[PDB]
Structures are given as C-alpha cells and as structure tokens.
Amino acid sequence: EDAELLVTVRGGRLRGIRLKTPGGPVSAFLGIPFAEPPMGPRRFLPPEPKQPWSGVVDATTFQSVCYQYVDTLYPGFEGTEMWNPNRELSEDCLYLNVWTPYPRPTSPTPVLVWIYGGGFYSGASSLDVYDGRFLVQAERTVLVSMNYRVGAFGFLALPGSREAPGNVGLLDQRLALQWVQENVAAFGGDPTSVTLFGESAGAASVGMHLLSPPSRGLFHRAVLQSGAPNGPWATVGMGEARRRATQLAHLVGCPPGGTGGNDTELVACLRTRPAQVLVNHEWHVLPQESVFRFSFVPVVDGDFLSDTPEALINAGDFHGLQVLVGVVKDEGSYFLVYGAPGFSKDNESLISRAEFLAGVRVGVPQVSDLAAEAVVLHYTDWLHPEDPARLREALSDVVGDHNVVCPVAQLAGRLAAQGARVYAYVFEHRASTLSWPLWMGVPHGYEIEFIFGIPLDPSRNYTAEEKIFAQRLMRYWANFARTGDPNEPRDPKAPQWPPYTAGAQQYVSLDLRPLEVRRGLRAQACAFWNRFLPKLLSAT
Amino acid sequence: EDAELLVTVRGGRLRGIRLKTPGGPVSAFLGIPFAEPPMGPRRFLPPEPKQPWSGVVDATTFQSVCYQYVDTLYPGFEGTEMWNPNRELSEDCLYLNVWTPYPRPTSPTPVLVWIYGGGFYSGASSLDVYDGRFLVQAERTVLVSMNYRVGAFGFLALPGSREAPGNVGLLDQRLALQWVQENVAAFGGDPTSVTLFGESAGAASVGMHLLSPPSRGLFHRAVLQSGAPNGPWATVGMGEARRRATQLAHLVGCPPGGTGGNDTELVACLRTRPAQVLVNHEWHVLPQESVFRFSFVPVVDGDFLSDTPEALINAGDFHGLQVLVGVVKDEGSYFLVYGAPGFSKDNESLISRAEFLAGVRVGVPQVSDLAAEAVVLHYTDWLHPEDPARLREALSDVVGDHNVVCPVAQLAGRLAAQGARVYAYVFEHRASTLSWPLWMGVPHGYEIEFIFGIPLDPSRNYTAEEKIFAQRLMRYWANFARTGDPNEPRDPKAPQWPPYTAGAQQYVSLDLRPLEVRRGLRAQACAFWNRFLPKLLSAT
C-alpha cells in the first residue's frame, strides 16, 4: 500500500492515483471539490466553499464538465473534438485537480495553476491536452487546475442585481486560488510561490486576476498565452450584458406572458429551466454575425473590476511582478472557418476580394464603414490587391491582431513600463500531428500540447525533435515559475531570453531552432489598432 | 557669315548663333519673340501673337526673364541661385529659343519642347541647366523652350471676369506650341512629332496640356518629371484664387479707400502698380504657413480646364498617346528647409518628434487634426518613434509622397489603364557636384542637369561615369521623342524598360548601374493619400 496517495486537506481526506510517464510516476488527485455544487437556487450565484466531508473522497478520475455548448461543426474531427467535453455535463462541476511528483517533495515547491480557455463559454480541466503528468515529472513542480462555470452559468449578468451579479465564473477561479493557499502545502507545494498560467480566455482570466485586488494577493507571477483582459472579446458593457441576459430569458420563455420582468422575477424563471435549454440558445444572443465574439463574458460592473481592464492597466503599479506573455504565429486563422465568407477547413480558402471585404465586417464587428475602410487600407497589399492567398493571410492577420496580438502587445508594454518584468514570445512551430489544414499555420491554441509535454506520450506519433522541443518549453515555463526568469540560472551557454521593455520590445521565437531575439510585436499593425482606430471611432 | 545662322520664319528673319560642344557645333536661335509684349493694358490678359517685323531680329542671346520672386535665403549658394534669374527682369519676356543640329537636318526631325518648373512663381528658359546644346548635339533632335508668365502676371485670377481670367501663363505656353507648329519646320523640325517635357510645375503644365483640348493637337507625346496636374499644389479653386487676388490688391493699395470694388476697378488699379511692387507681396497671400504651396497657380476656371484635373484624368481617353513619367529619390527633402521646424541646410537636421509632429502640419496644410494623426500613423516607425534620422526622412517622405510621388503614380496608372502607353522611372543618382547637404539625397529638380547633358560641359567637374550616364539618359529621352519608346529600337544587349501598367506597376531605376526593374511607385504609401485620406476628409 502506497501511503503517498492518501492526503488530508482542510475539508477531509482524499485518495489519489498514480500516473505513469516514460520518466517515472506522478501522484495525482483529480476531482477535489472546492465549492458547494452551484445548483438550484445557487445558479448564477457566487460560489461558496465546500463544507467538510466525512471519510475518504475518491480523487482518481476527473469530475463532471460544466454545462457548455459542444462543437458539432466537424463530427469526428480531432481538431475540434480535442476541445469538447470528455466527461458528462453537470452544473455540479466545481472541482479542481492537483498533480505532485513522486516522491512527494519534502521542501516546499513552486505551484503552477492552470486556467483553461474557451471563450468563457466552453472548456474543462479534464481535457487530454491539459494532462499535467509530464510537466510535473520533468520539472518536479506542483500543478493545480480547476473547473469554473462558463457560459450563462458563469457570466450571465443582470448588473446591480443580487441574483445574477455576473463574473461568478471568475469567482470560481478565485475560490480555487484561495483553496490552493490553504491546502497546496499538504501536497508539497509552496503557497508563497504560485504562478498563474492560462490560454485564450484563461489568459484573459489571469489578466483580470492581476487587476482585481482580492485576487492579486493569491498569486505572485502570471503567464498569459494568446489572450489578455483588454481584448475586444474578453469583457462586455453593463447595458449590453443586461440585453443579452434578457434576450436569453425571452428565448426560453422568461418571463411568462402576462407577468412583470424585474431582475428578481427574471432570474427566478431562469433557475427553473433545465441547464441544457439555456445552452441551446446561447449563440442566438450575440448582436450580429461575427467571429471571436462570445455571448457571456466578464462584465465591467465595479465589483470584480472596479473599472474597465484598459483603465486599470494604465493606472496600475506592477512593481514586484513578473509576467510571461506570448502569441502563436497564426492567431486568427482558426476563427475564419467559423463565419468568414469563402473559408473552409477542407479546401485552400483562396478567397476573393469581395469575400475579403465582407470578411472584414465579420472579423471586426460593430465599427463604422469608415473604420472598415481603414482596416482594408492597412491590411491590403496594394501591389497584389486581388491575390487570394495574400487576402487569406491578410484576414487572418486582421482577426489575430485585433483580438490577440495587439491587446497582448499593449498589455506587455504597459506592464513593463510600470514596474513589471515582462518576457515575451512568439510560438512558431506547427505540430507534425496537426489535423487542421496547412494554410492555417500555427493556429490559436496549438502551443498548449508542447507546454504540457504531450509529445512525451509514447502513444502518440510526435517526432524526436518535438520531444526535445517540449522539454525545452517545460524548462522555460518551470524556470519562470521558480525564479521569475525563464532563463537557466546555472547556464550562460544556452541562448538568452531578454526581457520585454516598452522601448526595445524584444521577444523570442519559440521553435525547433535555438532562441532568436526579435524586436516589435507587430508594431506597425498594432499602432493602427491601439493608437489610431480609437481616435477614429471617437470622431465616428 | 554662315548660311545656317540665317533663318526666316512667318514673322520675319532671324540671325542665330553657333554654340560649341566637345562633339561638334550646334545652331541656336535664342530670344525669338512669339507674342506681343504683355505690358500696360495687356497685363493679366491672354497673349496675342507677335506682329511680323521688318529686318533681321537678333537671336544670339537669351531675352529677359519674366518678373518673379528671387530666392535670397542663401546668398551665394549654388543650390538656390542656379534657379534664380540670370537675365534682367521685365514684363517683356515672351520669347522662345530653338536649338538645332549642325548641319541643319535635311529630313524632318522630332522636336522636344521644354517647359521649365518653379512652382508657377519663378523659372526661366535661360537657366544654365536648361542649355540644350548637348542634347541636340548628341541626339540630333530639335529642342524648343519658351518663357511663360509666372506669379501674379501669369496666374492672378478673378474668375469669370474679362480683365483677369487667369491661366494666361498656360496660354503663353500654348501660343509657343502654336508657334512651333507653324515655324519649327524652318529649323529642320517635324511638327508632326512634338514631345513636351517639363519638370515640377513644368510637368504639371505638360499634364494640363494633355487635359486641354485646344492644346492636345499641338503635340503627340508627353514627359512629366516630378510633377502632375492633379497635385495638391498645381491648382486652386475659383473662390480661393479670387481671395488671393483681392488680398494682393489690398496689400498694394487697391482699391484706394474708399472706391471699391468690382473686378474692373480692381484689375485697373493693379495695372497701375509697378511690377516689382506686385512681386514683393506675392507670398503674403498664402492662407497658412506651409511648404510646397504657391500663391498664384492654374485656376479651375472652366475655360482652359473644363473640370478639375482629377476629373478629366479619370474620364479621359488616352489611346494613341505615349507618356514618360518619373520622380527623384528624395522629392521632399528640398522643401523642408523652407519652413519645417528644426531643419537647416547647414546642419544634419536631426529633428525631434515634437518638431516632426509640427512639421506634418506644415507639410500637409489645411487638414483636420484627425487627418494629421493618420499621416503620423503611416509615417512613424513605431519601433523607433523618436529616432531623429528616421523622423527626418519620414517628413521628407510625407512632403514628397503628398506633393509629387503619389499624384504622379495616380496619373500614371489611370493613363495606362485608359489607353496610354506609359513608362515610369525613379532617378536615384546624386550628382557628385551637388551643393545641398548629404541628408537631402537626390532632391527635387536634380535630374534635369543629367537630362540636358550638362556633365558634358568641359568647364564642369563631373566624373567620367557621370558623363556616360548623361549620354544614356539623353538616348532614353530622345528615343521616346522619336519612337515613343525609350528602349533602343534594335539593340537587345541593353536591359529592357518595360511599360508601366496599372496592374504590374513596373518602373526602372535610373543611376550609374544598368536598368533595374521594380514594381510599385510607393504603393502602400500612395494608397493612403490616393484612396483612404479623401474618404477621411468627407467625414469631417
């Protein structure tokens, strides 16, 4: 009997499971409840801590996935199914997971805390590409990942009201961070050295935790992969969130024909509906045809976010903070097959000029016709204004710069110029096993498999060079978690990773080749989005 | 006495002069009167043809320069004084010059007609850099150049009135073209093969002759060097021309307070003032501080130009017309010394960003603050937004693209797409004897000395390679005058000069190296000026 799989936390006792890697075993505790199940009258409410339990809670498998929309555009396609839920759906989903090395560390070890992405409408900590066994084995750190409510269950907001305040999905993450402070020591983890890291909407979530005072004291470092809280998709206005919540209520029959519709009666009717019924009308709430836009996202209300993200990033002091940020080479290509005209994952997507001009209105929704003309001016090769391949890459740049690269570059510069030590990267390796078409390049989200060391899985067809590459990245991420610096402390031989400053703006390319230093995170294109376009929309 | 220096034209007999070149003599007839002297009651009026004369008019020296402002900002400086008048000033200045080879051609020979530039406020056919002896000797063509009224005497306009209709300086050029049609055969020239060519305001003039029906039948080909009729400086509206004419009248005491009033009393008062008094107030009528803006330019009256140059270029059939067009490498650097803050010809002009932002308002006058922001966005390197050297070259590009390169590229593409055969160039050689500072590169107007073969002058200190380079350019310009094609009619050894098309946008670089084909006349920058900025100004 291995006594390392039994651990006591503040709520009770747990039984973990041993997971095998080619380099040795790892102890895992999957499905630890950290909150009371937010069901019935608890729907749309902030989480409450899980009351203590008797006996031994089994923590050998992942728990249920939070209720969410399931992508069915390409049945059986690995590129989409890998993000779909792999456990049954349930509102009883507030469970976290802890990986710890074997043998358990005797000295306190820095903690990595993963927040999955998924546009705040989908995602789960149980996905195969978030398997923390290879990161924990190779770098002997403690990895924690949690589930948080997505969609309407996590971000439906009737602002100012008490029954649907909004941002409860972000509060689920905060409660999981408080849980790590109180219990990660029992697994050998250092609660004075926890490093948040997430991708897409998870990276946005990590950003909102920097900008929220009650969350800032629960972590010490931050990693933002292909996402930022200031993105045009990561937050929504007060009145718009109320319109979307009311529109979802109408689509499911709330309020009933004849009764009033104040905030109390609306949520009460919403709580009587089956969870799947709410999911089935989530996308019928967005105001127009678009890509990279999601129905229920964090709302700027004055509570969790005292002001807009952009305002708090500008007026914030970030001394004593180290941040690692980055993007993939082709941030926008993944989203074009989800609404842009002429695009298909099963052909070359050689769009026409008319389709490019229409796609700009889909990729940049809710802007004046003059604002669209400015986007077309900046993203057109006027020597080849009709070349389909160049137009395909241009619209991908339009969506990627507008939604990811430029919001991230703005955040990285403001952080470095106001106290924080920032490191920036651009992930440029396309996995040899990638199932998306070749023209998509390195799409949004396909650096995660290499961060988590998935190529080490012997049941996969990764190349030997990708195995070495995955170990390089895991050392980078673990070094930043330990020391706040991705560079090797005992090594001037390896190529060095310079910090990112507001002036020099240095970043490194992450690929099979050694580290290469570059300057400018798409500086020319991001000046249009971050500096000029707001001045244009003000004069409308 | 040489029988070749005696020539009879329709108005009377002339006596020419023999000019020496290192390769042989040339017959020149300098100072032929082609119009009645526009003095007294004829000031501001269209020219009348020169009445026939008895006896032999002496045509052995250049005649008087038309009244114009004299640049004095750098006394003794060769760079500025080479454009200043080199004959005495007089309103009696409507004279032309004819160069012809020795011996006089027995078969009709193609004719080149030069129109000097100078912002429609200065210039003269007698300048040393317009000496046609080397071009006529090397290529055995006939060269004609005329004087036309500049400043208020050529372009003061009270539109609609009979006393000052405007554009009389352009009519001066047209009358000289009618003279060439009627008399160039007496010098051995072919009136069916007349090729206009001019620089700056001369190139703009050549463009306005393409767009004026009464002038189109007087020539067959056109060359536009660093200028176009659609430039922001080449024309003014009727209301603005009336305001400038009235302010000039006020500055010289017209009308005498208090008499008024209408156009007849105003022009009559203007005719009584000495010509120098009018010249001394020419610059004090410009609406704001600026560079590359001139007080009295061609007006869009409705007579000479039935519509704006831009409208006529778009709605024009140019089939059966060959056009040579081009610019110099640094079109804007010359003008920054004349008003842009922080600039001086006697230092490095390493301006600050504050000076760059202010200089944008001088280089792009009369635009909204939002328009200036768009200019700053396009012309700032956001990796080095404050580097003085990059800012200096950026503002030069702002002035050059806005005033020359983009107006020329707009005209060239619409000409080729509407029937005209077009050839484009970019002059990239800086003369070894250039007196302007190094940071100016190849400034506005410093390809002229190579077109006219000035390096062949033994009294100058040009290099041996510049002499060969000058002969190459003279063959290019003459081949286009003879055949409409700058390429050698048979020689395949020399690299080919492809026509400029609206799609391929091919041009060649003219320098000491052989011809190099390139694509796009600053395509990205000119899409901002020609496509986006007009749409920005409609929505103020």
SS3 sequence, B276-321? HHHHCCCHHHCCCCCCCCCCCCCECCCCCCCCCHHHHHHCCCCCCC
Whole-number CA gyration radius for chain B: 23
Q: Which residue, among A357, A368, A377, A538, would best test binding to B if mutated, counting the most B CBs under 10 Å from its CB?
A: A377
Whole-number CA gyration radius for chain A: 23
Which stretches within A122-231 are classed as H helix? 133-139, 152-155, 168-183, 201-210, 213-216
Q: How far apart are CA B469 and CA B429, in angstroms?
A: 10
Nearest chain A residue to B375, by CA:
A532
Q: Are B68 and B90 in contact (CB under 8 A)?
A: no
Contacts for A311 with CB less than 8 Å, ≥ 6 apart: none
Q: How far apart are CA B15 and CA B30, in angstroms?
A: 9
Nearest chain B residue to A524, by CA:
B382
The residue among B266, B231, B192 whose CA lies nearest residue B484 is: B192
Q: Which tokens in the block code for residue A257?
A: 């024909």
Q: Which tokens in the block code for residue B113?
A: 């007609």
For residues A236-248, one letter each, b for 16 or more C-beta atoms within 10 angstroms of the residue's C-beta and e for the rest, the string is bebeebbebbbeb
**Burial label, A286 (beta-carbon count in 10 A; 0-12, 13-18, 19+):** middle
Q: Is A53 annotated as a binding residue?
A: no
The residue among B313, B316, B318 whose CA lies nearest residue B484 is: B318
Name the packing angle between helices A263-271 and A238-251 (round to 10°): 50
Resolution of this deposited model, Å: 2.4
**The domain containing residue A4 runs over which residues?**
1-540
What are the CA-CA distances from residue B73 to residues A100, A224, B66, B76, B129 (Å)?
79, 58, 20, 10, 21
Query: What strands lie across the sheet with A12-15, from one edge to the other?
Result: A6-9, A12-15, A56-58
Inter-chain residue contact B527 with A380, CB threshold 8 Å: yes
By DSSP bridging, strand B189-199 and strand B221-225 are: parallel
Q: How many CB pairs under 8 A join A and B?
A: 42
Tell me the three state secondary structure of residue B521.
Answer: coil
Q: How far apart are CA B340 and CA A343, in angstroms?
A: 49
Residue listed under structure tokens 């020399």? B494
Provide the 10 A C-beta neighbour count for residue B217. Answer: 10
Residue A167 phi, psi (nearest 5): 60, 15
CA contacts within 13 A on the Cβ side of B276: 4
Q: Which long-range contacts (CB under 8 A, 24 or more apart) does A101-105 make?
A: A101/A26, A101/A27, A101/A136, A101/A137, A101/A140, A101/A141, A101/A142, A101/A188, A102/A4, A102/A18, A102/A24, A102/A25, A102/A26, A102/A27, A103/A4, A104/A4, A104/A27, A104/A187, A104/A188, A105/A140, A105/A142, A105/A188, A105/A189
CA contacts within 13 A on the Cβ side of B106: 0
Inter-chain residue contact B527 with A382, CB threshold 8 Å: yes
Inter-chain residue contact B523 with A383, CB threshold 8 Å: yes
DSSP3 helix / strand / coil % (chain B, rounded to 5): 35, 15, 45
Amino acid at B344: S
**Burial label, A128 (beta-carbon count in 10 A; 0-12, 13-18, 19+):** exposed
The residue among A333, A300, A115 whose CA lies nearest residue A224 is: A115
Q: How far apart are CA A303 and CA A213, in angstroms?
A: 10
Q: Are A344 and A454 in contact (CB under 8 A)?
A: no
Q: Which residue, among B353, B377, B380, B524, would best test binding to A if mutated, counting the most A CBs under 10 Å from its CB?
A: B377
Inter-chain residue contact B527 with A370, CB threshold 8 Å: no
Q: Which tokens in the block code for residue A206?
A: 């990590």
For residues B258-278, one letter each, b for 16 or more C-beta atoms within 10 angstroms of the residue's C-beta and e for the rest, the string is eeeeebebbbebbbebebeeb
Inter-chain residue contact A383 with B527, CB threshold 8 Å: no
Tell me the three state secondary structure of residue A109.
Answer: strand
> Using what technique was this structure determined?
X-ray
For residue B255, whether the previous peptide bond is cis, meaning omega lies within 30 degrees of 0, is yes
Q: Are B509 and B493 in contact (CB under 8 A)?
A: no
Q: How far apart are CA B374 and CA B522, in angstroms?
A: 17
What are the CA-CA distances from residue B125 to residues A148, A270, B414, B444 (Å)?
82, 88, 31, 18
Q: How far apart are CA A471 and CA A455, in angstroms?
A: 9
What are the CA-CA distances from residue A229 to residues A110, A235, A415 (Å)?
25, 7, 13
Q: How far apart are CA B444 and CA B435, in angstroms?
A: 13
Q: How far apart are CA A478 and CA A482, in angstroms?
A: 6
Q: Which tokens in the block code for residue A414?
A: 């403001």
Closest residue to A539, CB basis, from B370, B505, B519: B370
Q: Are B31 and B61 in contact (CB under 8 A)?
A: yes
Looking at chain B, after which residues does the C atom sit over 2.5 Å from the next written N, breaking the chain? none
Q: Are B408 and B529 in contact (CB under 8 A)?
A: no
Q: How far is A35 from chain B (nearest CA, A)?
A: 48
Contacts for B306 with CB less than 8 Å, ≥ 6 apart: B312
Q: Which tokens in the block code for residue B177?
A: 């073209």
Q: Following CA atoms B183, B189, B195, B200 in sequence, which dihedral angle do they give, to the nearest 10 degrees?
A: -70
Residue B517 phi, psi (nearest 5): -90, 135
CA B171 to chain centre: 15
Would you give the end-to-end CA distance of chain B in angstroms?
70
The residue among A377, A390, A314 whose CA lies nearest residue A533 is: A377
Q: How far apart are CA B447 and CA A358, in angstroms?
A: 45
Q: Following CA atoms B129, B134, B140, B144 in sequence, which dihedral angle do they give, to the nearest 10 degrees?
A: 20
**Burial label, A472 (beta-carbon count in 10 A; 0-12, 13-18, 19+):** middle
Q: Is the dihedral of CA A39, A40, A44, A49 positive or negative?
A: negative
Q: Which residue, among A370, A373, A382, would best test binding to B if mutated, counting the most B CBs under 10 Å from its CB?
A: A382
What are the CA-CA distances from residue A14 to residues A8, A57, A106, B356 (Å)?
6, 5, 19, 67
DSSP for B73-97 reads SSTT-HHHHTTS-SS-B-S---EEE
For residues B407-437, one letter each, b for 16 or more C-beta atoms within 10 angstroms of the residue's C-beta and e for the rest, the string is bbbbbbbbbbebebbbbbbbbbbbbeebebb
Q: Is B114 annotated as a binding residue?
A: no
Inter-chain residue contact A382 with B524, CB threshold 8 Å: yes
Q: How far apart are CA B498 and CA B485, in angstroms?
A: 10
What are the CA-CA distances from residue A536 to residues A370, A404, A525, A529 (Å)?
9, 21, 15, 10
Q: Is B199 annotated as a binding residue?
A: yes
Q: How far apart are CA B380 and CA B378, in angstroms?
A: 6
Let me know how many helices (H) and strands (E) chain B has, helices first.
19, 14
Q: How far apart are CA B361 and CA B372, in angstroms?
A: 7
CA A415 to chain centre: 19
Contacts for A478 with CB less than 8 Å, ≥ 6 apart: A110, A112, A135, A138, A139, A141
Query: What strands lie across the sheet with A109-115, from one edge to the other?
Result: A17-21, A24-33, A95-101, A142-146, A109-115, A189-199, A221-225, A322-328, A421-427, A506-510, A516-519
Q: Which tokens in the block code for residue B359?
A: 């200089």
The residue among B470, B467, B458 whose CA lies nearest residue B427 is: B470
Q: How many domains does chain B have?
A: 1
Q: Is A130 annotated as a binding residue?
A: yes
Q: Are B382 and A528 in contact (CB under 8 A)?
A: no
What are the CA-CA distances from residue B237 to residues A245, A491, B299, B301, B302 (Å)?
56, 71, 6, 8, 11
Angle CA(B224)–CA(B229)–CA(B235) in degrees, nearest 5? Answer: 145
By DSSP bridging, strand A189-199 and strand A322-328 are: unpaired
Q: Is A436 annotated as a binding residue?
A: yes
CATH classification of the domain holding A226: 3.40.50.1820
Query: What strands lie across the sheet with B12-15, from one edge to the other?
Result: B6-9, B12-15, B56-58
Give, as one character, the DSSP assignment of residue A495.
P
Contacts for B419 with CB less than 8 Å, ≥ 6 apart: B317, B318, B319, B320, B321
Q: Are B15 and B59 in contact (CB under 8 A)?
A: yes
Whats the size of chain A, residue-wise? 540
Q: How far is B503 from chain A (nearest CA, A)?
A: 8
Cβ-based interface (< 8 Å): residues of B facing A: 370, 373-374, 377, 380-383, 505, 519-520, 523-524, 526-528, 531-532, 535-536, 539
DSSP for B425-486 reads EEE-PPPTT--S-GGG-S-TTTTHHHHTTGGG-TTS---HHHHHHHHHHHHHHHHHHHHS-S
Residue listed under structure tokens 């507008």? A402
Q: How far apart are CA A163 and CA B57, in angstroms?
A: 104
Residue A137 phi, psi (nearest 5): -65, -45
What are the CA-CA distances from residue A242 to residues A159, A258, A265, A273, A304 (Å)?
7, 21, 14, 19, 17
Q: How far is A406 from chain B (nearest CA, A)?
A: 13
Phi-psi region of A98 (alpha: psi -120 to 50; beta: other; left: phi over 0): beta
Q: How far apart are CA A114 and CA B434, in angstroms?
A: 66
Closest residue to A370, CB basis, from B377, B519, B535: B535
Residue listed under structure tokens 């989005």? A529
The residue among B97, B41, B87 whose CA lies nearest residue B66 is: B87
Q: Which tokens in the block code for residue A75?
A: 């049945």
Whats the size of chain B, residue-wise? 540
Tell me the three state secondary structure of residue A194.
Answer: strand
